[PDB]
Design an enzyme around this catalytic site. Structure first.
Site, mmCIF file in Angstrom:
data_model
loop_
_atom_site.group_PDB
_atom_site.id
_atom_site.type_symbol
_atom_site.label_atom_id
_atom_site.label_comp_id
_atom_site.label_asym_id
_atom_site.label_seq_id
_atom_site.Cartn_x
_atom_site.Cartn_y
_atom_site.Cartn_z
ATOM 1 N N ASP A 181 0.827 -1.213 0.000
ATOM 2 C CA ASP A 181 0.000 0.000 0.000
ATOM 3 C C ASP A 181 0.862 1.265 0.000
ATOM 4 O O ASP A 181 0.519 2.252 -0.656
ATOM 5 C CB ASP A 181 -0.934 0.030 1.227
ATOM 6 C CG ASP A 181 -2.316 -0.615 0.994
ATOM 7 O OD1 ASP A 181 -2.560 -1.312 -0.012
ATOM 8 O OD2 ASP A 181 -3.188 -0.416 1.877
ATOM 9 N N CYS A 215 -2.513 0.642 -13.498
ATOM 10 C CA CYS A 215 -2.567 0.634 -12.039
ATOM 11 C C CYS A 215 -3.724 1.559 -11.676
ATOM 12 O O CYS A 215 -4.766 1.491 -12.326
ATOM 13 C CB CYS A 215 -1.200 1.002 -11.456
ATOM 14 S SG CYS A 215 -0.405 2.522 -12.213
ATOM 15 N N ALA A 217 -3.538 5.287 -11.536
ATOM 16 C CA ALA A 217 -3.429 6.391 -12.492
ATOM 17 C C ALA A 217 -2.829 5.984 -13.834
ATOM 18 O O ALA A 217 -2.963 6.734 -14.810
ATOM 19 C CB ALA A 217 -2.577 7.532 -11.910
ATOM 20 N N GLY A 218 -2.192 4.835 -13.904
ATOM 21 C CA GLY A 218 -1.528 4.388 -15.124
ATOM 22 C C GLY A 218 -0.204 5.076 -15.453
ATOM 23 O O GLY A 218 0.147 5.155 -16.641
ATOM 24 N N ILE A 219 0.547 5.530 -14.446
ATOM 25 C CA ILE A 219 1.852 6.167 -14.686
ATOM 26 C C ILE A 219 2.954 5.695 -13.747
ATOM 27 O O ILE A 219 4.144 5.707 -14.110
ATOM 28 C CB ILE A 219 1.723 7.710 -14.621
ATOM 29 C CG1 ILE A 219 1.258 8.190 -13.248
ATOM 30 C CG2 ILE A 219 0.799 8.215 -15.714
ATOM 31 C CD1 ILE A 219 1.236 9.736 -13.101
ATOM 32 N N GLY A 220 2.612 5.254 -12.540
ATOM 33 C CA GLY A 220 3.645 4.902 -11.575
ATOM 34 C C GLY A 220 4.146 3.460 -11.608
ATOM 35 O O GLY A 220 5.196 3.185 -12.204
ATOM 36 N N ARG A 221 3.426 2.528 -10.962
ATOM 37 C CA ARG A 221 3.723 1.099 -11.142
ATOM 38 C C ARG A 221 3.739 0.697 -12.619
ATOM 39 O O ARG A 221 4.588 -0.103 -13.045
ATOM 40 C CB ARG A 221 2.692 0.247 -10.384
ATOM 41 C CG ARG A 221 2.699 0.491 -8.897
ATOM 42 C CD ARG A 221 1.556 -0.227 -8.185
ATOM 43 N NE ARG A 221 1.326 0.377 -6.872
ATOM 44 C CZ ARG A 221 0.347 0.022 -6.044
ATOM 45 N NH1 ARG A 221 -0.500 -0.937 -6.393
ATOM 46 N NH2 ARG A 221 0.214 0.636 -4.865
ATOM 47 N N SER A 222 2.772 1.194 -13.397
ATOM 48 C CA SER A 222 2.696 0.883 -14.836
ATOM 49 C C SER A 222 3.970 1.316 -15.564
ATOM 50 O O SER A 222 4.456 0.618 -16.465
ATOM 51 C CB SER A 222 1.482 1.586 -15.461
ATOM 52 O OG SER A 222 0.223 1.036 -15.015
ATOM 53 N N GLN A 262 6.566 7.863 -10.507
ATOM 54 C CA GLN A 262 5.934 8.928 -9.712
ATOM 55 C C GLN A 262 6.755 9.405 -8.519
ATOM 56 O O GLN A 262 6.434 10.463 -7.955
ATOM 57 C CB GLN A 262 4.578 8.449 -9.168
ATOM 58 C CG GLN A 262 3.462 8.429 -10.170
ATOM 59 C CD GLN A 262 2.158 7.877 -9.559
ATOM 60 O OE1 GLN A 262 2.048 6.692 -9.237
ATOM 61 N NE2 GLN A 262 1.190 8.746 -9.382
#
Ligand SMILES: CS(=O)(=O)Nc1ccc(Cl)cc1
Length: 282
Positions: A181, A215, A217-222, A262
């Site tokens: 988390d 994920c 927002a689709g920018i960090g883990r992705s 991010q």
């Protein structure tokens, strides 16, 4: 500089925040005018995360062709990815329309539906074989075929049917279920094992449309997923693997979607993953 020793040099000097801020300063800025039209407000999860106009995926619809999704096309590596936000209650039908129209084989999910006590994306796939889902706005039917639950991730086989034409296709759902988390994983081993399972399935290969990765927002883990995959592929293709510059690859990817990676912790984790992964490949 090489990667593994640049890595130790940033750790010893404690300058990850400064490296990451340099990336943010140099990153591309392109217009996202379609994302900001008033008619699209309930199609965006976060007001500060939008697809650029030049690289956005268009739905094959004449009313409203907008979805918060971007095509990342990596020319030297010969890989493409679609990066998108976690679907919203009013965009689950658009999401599966995109999968269908772009001829994707696989969907990669890097978040849980609930994290930190709040909803991070809609429950957009069926959880029981005998309870299928129908998306009436885009005329698609989705059925759970099988599910394999492992300790760090789950793989599902899904059937997507275009109800207009009665055509069917098999979609593979790769769900990484153990990202914490807060922060990033302590070791990249399970994330790399997961990446290799996606690769082994064919979902990243040129005989299919681009993989869809998300994920919240689709920018960090992705961003971490596609950055690691592309860097490892380039290290296999080139005569000199130590020439692969992870910061330059990230800036290339940020020409196609804003904000990839991010936090400075996500940047350090991406270095760690590529470094460990390059040893296992050989
Ligand atoms: C063996 S089976 O029941 O037909 N398996 C199956 C069914 C449907 C799809 Cl899309 C993929 C696999």
């Amino acid at each position: 500089m090489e990667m593994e020793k640049e890595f130790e040099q940033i750790d010893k000097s404690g300058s990850w925040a400064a490296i990451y801020q340099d990336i943010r300063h140099e990153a591309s800025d392109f217009p996202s005018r379609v994302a900001k039209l008033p008619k699209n407000k309930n199609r965006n999860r976060y007001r500060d995360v939008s697809p650029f106009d030049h690289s956005r995926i268009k739905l094959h619809q004449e009313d409203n062709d907008y979805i918060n999704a971007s095509l990342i096309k990596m020319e030297e590596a010969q890989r493409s990815y679609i990066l998108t936000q976690g679907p919203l209650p009013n965009t689950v039908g658009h999401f599966w329309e995109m999968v269908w129209e772009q001829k994707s084989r696989g969907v990669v999910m890097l978040n849980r539906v609930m994290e930190k006590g709040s909803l991070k994306c809609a429950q957009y796939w069926p959880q029981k074989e005998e309870k299928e889902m129908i998306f009436e706005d885009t005329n698609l039917k989705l059925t759970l075929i099988s599910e394999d639950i492992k300790s760090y991730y789950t793989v599902r086989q899904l059937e997507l049917e275009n109800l207009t034409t009665q055509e069917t296709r098999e979609i593979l759902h790769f769900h990484y279920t153990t990202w914490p988390d807060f922060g990033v994983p302590e070791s990249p081993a399970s994330f790399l094992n997961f990446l290799f399972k996606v690769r082994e399935s064919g979902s990243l290969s040129p005989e299919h449309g681009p993989v869809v990765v998300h994920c919240s927002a689709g920018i960090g883990r992705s961003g971490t997923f596609c950055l690691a995959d592309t860097c490892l592929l380039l290290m296999d293709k080139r005569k000199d693997p130590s020439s692969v510059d992870i910061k330059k690859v990230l800036l290339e990817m940020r020409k196609f979607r804003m904000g990839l990676i991010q936090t400075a912790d996500q940047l350090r984790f991406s270095y760690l993953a590529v470094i460990e992964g390059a040893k296992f490949i050989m």
